[PDB]
Ligand binder design. Structure first.
Ligand code: HEC
Lengths: 55, 431
């Protein structure tokens, strides 16, 4: 809170933080994609896709 | 360089060449695989095989004669080679096999021994001759449900179910007179042969015409014969080309010469003046390739064929090649056109004038059957030299730019991308 209760130090740090976090999500989204790229997407049949892929 | 041809009852065509050592005579029919059906497909190949059978072949051999035959899409031909003196004994063997023995060659002991040979033959083809197997399939999908789609050697299924009655049925419908041309090449004179022919009369099924059908049409499509056990990838790709007797028969044939053919192992091949080689040689995209402008009566195929062991870069092979073809519509240079002219003449020469009369016979018969006459080699050169950059550009803008294609391949073709990817490369983005 930065004080006795939710006040001026609270909302101002919350704004600073609201701006920061989205860029951490972006970096996390890149790691998500990196992990997806090593084995590729799955498919509705639940089996391998290696025998018939399209660009 | 003389194209002599006269009609009395039978249309006789000859092309004499003094110094020859030998002479060849025979008949060429205006009907081939493009006249068969999906079910009697392979009849013509069968005929060729009995005409060359051990029995019939031994008869002409005693006489000092040699046999040769070739089945194509639009035509068929039976030829007997001999010395310049026995130019008459060939005419006896020709008539003896097409009238007298048109029932002796078809015995139940000959036909069965022959059928067993074409079956091991066509089978062997499909099991090992990959490049031709692919080119054959290219015609198969490009012209599907239409005449040109039928393979010349016939299918193993229509073959093993073919009977003697079918041979006769086909023979009685296409081996007619109005659909024939007696050819004579080697050294013998036009007036020398025409006499020995107008001597023996008899028409044998005159006035009869072969059946008609539906015109051949091109269809953008593909057939993929994946086989991961083969050590290479063989692919053929093409657009609808030009038919024989087309205003652009030559522009097209010239356009193919620009990219020509290549063999990565022959040092001189690597040095050719083809821009495409700068792109494919860096990572060695293929062992070889060869362009072509195949022409037939109703249609044709313009494209190339290639074989490669670089199975992880096939998309680059196809991409670079198709980018080069884009140029024919927008940036082909004068010197590229000129380099082509020279090289086209050289190859067209070596074909129309080799030291083998049998090739001359086929070419002569085939041409006279479609356009009632043969175009002299010198007459061709005049047309070839007349081609401007503007001609190539107008042709490509009609046949190559943003046009459907046909594909076919076998072997390790996992790397050959989808149709729409290849299809998209038939053009370029612009403002
Ligand atoms: C709790 C799970 C979870 C969350 C939340 C998540 N993902 Fe995914 N994502 C997956 C899984 C698992 C796959 C693999 C899907 C498959 O192939 O079956 C996937 C696949 C993908 C794909 C491939 C295409 C698809 O939709 O299957 C993309 C793109 C992707 N995620 C983007 C994102 C982005 C952007 C966010 C959010 C900012 C996100 N994901 C959040 C689980 C998640």
């Amino acid at each position: 809170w930065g004080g006795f209760s939710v006040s001026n130090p609270t909302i101002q740090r919350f704004f600073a933080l609201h701006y920061l976090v989205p860029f951490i999500i972006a970096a996390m989204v890149i790691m998500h994609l990196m992990a997806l790229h090593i084995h590729g997407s799955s498919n509705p049949l639940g089996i391998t896709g290696n025998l018939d892929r399209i660009p | 360089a003389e194209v002599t041809q006269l009609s009395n009852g039978i249309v006789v065509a000859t092309e004499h060449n003094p110094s020859a050592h030998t002479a060849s005579v025979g008949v060429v029919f205006g009907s081939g695989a493009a006249n068969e059906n999906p079910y009697n497909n392979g009849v013509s190949n069968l005929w060729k095989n009995i005409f060359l059978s051990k029995e019939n072949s031994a008869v002409a051999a005693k006489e000092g004669l040699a046999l040769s035959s070739n089945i194509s899409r639009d035509f068929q031909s039976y030829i007997v080679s001999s010395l310049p003196g026995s130019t008459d004994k060939s005419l006896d063997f020709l008539n003896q096999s097409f009238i007298q023995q048109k029932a002796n060659l078809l015995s139940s002991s000959n036909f069965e021994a022959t059928k067993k040979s074409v079956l091991k033959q066509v089978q062997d083809f499909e099991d090992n001759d990959h490049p031709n197997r692919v080119l054959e399939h290219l015609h198969s999908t490009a012209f599907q449900n239409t005449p040109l789609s039928l393979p010349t050697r016939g299918t193993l299924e229509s073959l093993e179910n073919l009977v003697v009655a079918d041979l006769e049925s086909f023979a009685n419908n296409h081996f007619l007179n109005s659909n024939a041309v007696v050819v004579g090449t080697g050294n013998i004179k036009h007036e020398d042969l025409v006499n020995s022919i107008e001597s023996k009369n008899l028409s044998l099924q005159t006035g009869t015409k072969p059946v008609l059908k539906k015109k051949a049409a091109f269809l953008g499509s593909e057939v993929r014969l994946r086989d991961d056990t083969l050590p290479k990838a063989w692919i053929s790709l093409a657009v609808e080309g030009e038919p024989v007797n087309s205003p652009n028969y030559f522009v097209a044939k010239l356009a193919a010469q620009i990219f020509g053919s290549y063999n990565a192992f022959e040092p001189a091949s690597r040095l050719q003046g083809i821009k495409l080689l700068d792109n494919i040689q860096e990572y060695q995209l293929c062992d070889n390739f060869n362009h072509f402008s195949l022409s037939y009566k109703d249609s044709g195929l313009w494209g190339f064929s290639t074989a490669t062991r670089n199975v992880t870069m096939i998309d680059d092979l196809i991409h670079f090649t198709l980018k080069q073809w884009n140029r024919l519509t927008i940036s082909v240079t004068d010197t590229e056109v000129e380099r082509a002219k020279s090289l086209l003449k050289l190859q067209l020469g070596q074909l129309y004038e080799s030291g083998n009369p049998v090739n001359d016979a086929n070419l002569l018969g085939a041409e006279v059957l479609i356009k009632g006459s043969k175009l002299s080699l010198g007459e061709a050169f005049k047309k070839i030299d007349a081609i401007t950059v503007k001609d190539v550009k107008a042709w490509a803008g009609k046949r190559l730019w943003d046009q459907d294609i046909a594909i076919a391949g076998t072997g390790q073709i996992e790397g050959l991308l989808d149709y729409m990817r290849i299809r998209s490369d038939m053009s370029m983005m612009r403002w």
